[PDB]
């Protein structure tokens, strides 16, 4: 359930530039990733439920390791794909 | 399926082939391919090439073109089998 | 909130977990892939992602 | 470091028949290796973090044998047992 004008429990798609976080230097690509946060109301039986990321997905990355060494990895659990209720 | 041109400049230490890669595809989400290099004096040095996971920045790009101007390490993204055998530079 | 259990694909036989306790929701933060050997339309090795709840917590 | 004997009999993809498989991954997290099996090596390779805590086979009368071990290149040798 992707979001729009806020009402229930949805997923909020927000993008962020690494330059804006101070990380645009050790990372060659991508330029930034998707912060997707779960925001929304939930039904009650479940005791109590909260909107939470129900699924994560990998983000590919090309950056430098500490030895000014270029690395390429598929970063695990970095993008919140879907939101569900606890 | 989606496969790509594979290249590793640091293949030796990392004990990998130096150069085709088949994209692992996790449950029908777009698949792309990349290329990275250097335009140091007026000479291009490869760094790496291979599959690249769903990137909002790679879709519908049939040709691998680096848009970023004046970087240390160039990088381009593309969609389409072996779309990274060729790569270029376009500042804007 | 606390990390509390194990249940019984070629291997392994069974994987692990649950997050329980209260918040002033207590759900897992750290997860765990684990290997699986099985049959695919009459075998493959996929070291599989997040089958186990590593560490819990609140929202 | 943890390295291990690698084997794939169905190598229609990028993966070669044999050779080792450098095993990397999670931090302080234990790493393990494996092997599965005229004797037919179905597949051998690295195995993620207890069935692994020598590579020996425990589960009786199976059709596809499997062992799990910790310690570099432990999977090269494998054998059979009862329960």
Curated annotation (Swiss-Prot), chain A:
Subcellular compartments: Secreted
- Which cysteines does the record link by disulfide bonds? 3-10, 9-51, 38-83, 42-85
Q: Where are its TM segments located?
A: none
Tell me which domain of life the UniProt entry assigns to the organism this sequence originates from: Eukaryota
In the record, the note on similarity to other proteins reads: Belongs to the TGF-beta family.
The task this protein performs is described as: Inhibins/activins are involved in regulating a number of diverse functions such as hypothalamic and pituitary hormone secretion, gonadal hormone secretion, germ cell development and maturation, erythroid differentiation, insulin secretion, nerve cell survival, embryonic axial development or bone growth, depending on their subunit composition.
Per UniProt, subunit arrangement is: Dimeric, linked by one or more disulfide bonds. Inhibin A is a dimer of alpha/INHA and beta-A/INHBA. Activin A is a homodimer of beta-A/INHBA. Activin AB is a dimer of beta-A/INHBA and beta-B/INHBB. Interacts with FST and FSTL3; these interactions prevent activin A interaction to its type II receptor. Activin A interacts with ACVR2A. Activin A interacts with BMPR2. Inhibin A interacts with ACVR1; this interaction creates a non-signaling complex (NSC) that inhibits ACVR1-mediated BMP signaling. Inhibin A interacts with ACVR2A.
Query: What is the protein name for this chain?
Result: Inhibin beta A chain
Q: Which organism is it from?
A: Homo sapiens (Human)
The gene name on file is INHBA
Portion of the full sequence shown:
312 to 426 of 426
Curated annotation (Swiss-Prot), chain B:
Source domain of life:
Eukaryota
Where does the record place it?
A: Cell membrane
How does the record describe the protein's post-translational processing? Phosphorylated. Constitutive phosphorylation is in part catalyzed by its own kinase activity.
Q: According to the UniProt topology, which residue ranges lie Extracellular? A: 1-92
Q: Which cysteines are joined by disulfide bonds?
A: 4-33, 23-51, 58-77, 64-76, 78-83
Which sites carry carbohydrate?
17, 39
Q: How does it assemble?
A: Forms an activin receptor complex with activin type II receptors such as ACVR1B. Interacts with VPS39. Interacts with DYNLT1. Interacts with BMP3. Interacts with BMP2.
Q: Which family does it belong to?
A: Belongs to the protein kinase superfamily. TKL Ser/Thr protein kinase family. TGFB receptor subfamily.
Describe its function.
Transmembrane serine/threonine kinase activin type-2 receptor forming an activin receptor complex with activin type-1 serine/threonine kinase receptors (ACVR1, ACVR1B or ACVR1c). Transduces the activin signal from the cell surface to the cytoplasm and is thus regulating many physiological and pathological processes including neuronal differentiation and neuronal survival, hair follicle development and cycling, FSH production by the pituitary gland, wound healing, extracellular matrix production, immunosuppression and carcinogenesis.
The protein, known as = Activin receptor type-2B
The full protein's residues present here are 26 to 118 of 513
Curated annotation (Swiss-Prot), chain D:
Post-translational changes noted in the entry: Phosphorylated. Constitutive phosphorylation is in part catalyzed by its own kinase activity.
Record's subcellular location: Cell membrane
Task: Give each disulfide bond as a residue pair.
Answer: 4-33, 23-46, 52-68, 55-67, 69-74
Q: What glycosylation sites does the entry record?
A: 16
| Positions on the Extracellular side per record topology | 1-83
Q: What does this protein do?
A: Transmembrane serine/threonine kinase activin type-2 receptor forming an activin receptor complex with activin type-1 serine/threonine kinase receptors (ACVR1, ACVR1B or ACVR1c). Transduces the activin signal from the cell surface to the cytoplasm and is thus regulating many physiological and pathological processes including neuronal differentiation and neuronal survival, hair follicle development and cycling, FSH production by the pituitary gland, wound healing, extracellular matrix production, immunosuppression and carcinogenesis.
The entry sums up its family as follows: Belongs to the protein kinase superfamily. TKL Ser/Thr protein kinase family. TGFB receptor subfamily.
Q: How does the annotation summarize its subunit structure?
A: Forms an activin receptor complex with activin type II receptors such as ACVR1B. Interacts with VPS39. Interacts with DYNLT1. Interacts with BMP3. Interacts with BMP2.
Q: What is this protein called?
A: Activin receptor type-2B
Per the UniProt record, the lineage of the source organism begins with: Eukaryota, Metazoa, Chordata, Craniata, Vertebrata
The shown chain, on whole-protein numbering, covers 26 to 118 of 513
């Amino acid at each position: 359930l992707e979001c729009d004008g806020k009402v229930i429990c949805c997923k909020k798609q927000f993008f962020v530039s690494f330059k804006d976080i101070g990380w645009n230097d050790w990372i060659i690509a991508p330029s930034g990733y998707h912060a997707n946060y779960c925001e929304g109301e939930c039904p009650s039986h479940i005791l109590k439920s909260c909107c939470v990321p129900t699924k994560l997905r990998p983000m590919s990355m090309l950056y430098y390791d500490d030895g000014q060494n270029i690395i390429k990895k598929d970063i695990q659990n970095m993008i919140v794909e879907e939101c569900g209720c606890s | 399926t989606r496969e790509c041109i594979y290249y590793n400049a640091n293949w030796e230490l990392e004990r990998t082939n130096q150069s085709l890669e088949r994209c692992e595809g996790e449950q029908d989400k777009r698949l792309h391919c990349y290329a990275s290099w250097r335009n140091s004096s007026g000479t291009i040095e490869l760094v790496k090439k291979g599959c690249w996971l769903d990137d909002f920045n790679c879709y519908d790009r049939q040709e691998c073109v680096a848009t970023e101007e004046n970087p240390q390490v160039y990088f381009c993204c593309c969609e389409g089998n072996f779309c990274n055998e060729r790569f270029t530079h376009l500042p804007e």
